[PDB]
Amino acid sequence: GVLHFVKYHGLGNDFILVDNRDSSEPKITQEQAAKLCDRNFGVGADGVIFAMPGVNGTDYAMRIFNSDGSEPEMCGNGVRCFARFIAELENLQGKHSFTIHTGAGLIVPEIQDDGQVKVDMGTPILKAQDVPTKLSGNKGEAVVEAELVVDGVSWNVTCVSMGNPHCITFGKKGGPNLKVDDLNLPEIGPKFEHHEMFPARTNTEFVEVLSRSHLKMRVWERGAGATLACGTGACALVVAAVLEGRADRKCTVDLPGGPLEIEWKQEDNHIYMTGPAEAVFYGSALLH
Ligand X SMILES: C[C@](N)(CCC[C@H](N)C(=O)O)C(=O)O
Contact between 265 and a second copy per CB under 8 A: no
Number of residues that bind a second copy (CB under 8 A): 50
CB of 67 to ligand X, least distance (A): 8
Cis ω before 132 (30° cut-off from 0):
yes
Provide the residue type at 87 as one letter. A
DSSP 225: B
Residues 136-165 that bind ligand X (CB under 6 A): 164
204 is in an annotated binding site: no
Q: Which of 61, 217, 228, 230 binds ligand X (CB under 6 A)?
A: 230
111-118's contacts with Cβ under 8 Å and 24+ in sequence apart are 111/83, 111/84, 111/87, 112/274, 115/84, 115/276, 115/277, 116/80, 116/274, 116/275, 116/276, 116/277, 117/79, 117/80, 117/83, 117/84, 117/274, 117/275, 117/276, 117/277, 118/272, 118/273, 118/274
Shortest distance, position 173 Cβ to ligand X, whole Å: 25
Interface stretch with a second copy, choices 112-120, 154-162, 193-201, 233-241 (CB under 8 A): 112-120
**Residue 267 interacts with a second copy (CB under 8 A)?**
no
- 3-state DSSP helix/strand/coil percent for the chain, to nearest 5? 15, 40, 45
Binding residues vs ligand X (CB under 6 A): 13, 47, 66, 72, 75-78, 164, 203, 221-224, 227, 230-233
Residues that bind a second copy (CB under 8 A): 1-2, 4, 6-7, 9, 12-14, 19, 21-24, 39-44, 46, 53-54, 59-60, 85, 88-96, 110, 113-115, 228, 257, 279-287
Feature table: binding site for substrate:
13, 66, 76-77, 164, 203, 221-222, 231-232
